[PDB]
Ligand binder design. Sequence first.
Ligand SMILES: c1ccc(-c2cnc[nH]2)cc1
Ligand SMILES: c1ccc(-c2cnc[nH]2)cc1
Ligand SMILES: [Cl-]
Ligand SMILES: [Cl-]
Ligand SMILES: [Zn+2]
Ligand SMILES: [Zn+2]
Length: 124
Amino acid sequence: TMGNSTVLSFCAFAVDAAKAYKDYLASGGQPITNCVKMLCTHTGTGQAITVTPEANMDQESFGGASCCLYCRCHIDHPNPKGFCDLKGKYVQIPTTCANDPVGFTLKNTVCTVCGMWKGYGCSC
Ligand SMILES: c1ccc(-c2cnc[nH]2)cc1
Ligand SMILES: c1ccc(-c2cnc[nH]2)cc1
Ligand SMILES: [Cl-]
Ligand SMILES: [Cl-]
Ligand SMILES: [Zn+2]
Ligand SMILES: [Zn+2]
């Protein structure tokens, strides 16, 4: 275990920060920790990204910015306006993936229909 600061610094200065973290995880690297876990009833909508925590019984809720590689690396977000979908919001992570919220949000996409993670919560 090399530490959050070491992993984030290594990814932050890579030309592709997302690829750097994914390659690190694929090599057996310990996931980034110290994400902000929320106290909640697990009775929520189960939508992926929300104004308040919305974990259902299959999810954990976290502070959005703490689970965002770009926020955690202090670098620009990969879109023209550099907007963050996670900052100031709460992200619902499947309990099976909640050991690596940064990796989960990086690798996954929200169903534009039901607002749940494609391949997980989404049953469209
Ligand atoms: C060992 C220790 C630190 C690092 C590093 C930190 N930021 C970039 N590389 C790389 C290997
Ligand atoms: C503490 C209490 C309950 C839970 C939980 C319930 N369903 C998923 N996680 C997680 C932490
Ligand atoms: Cl830390
Ligand atoms: Cl989900
Ligand atoms: Zn962000
Ligand atoms: Zn869906």
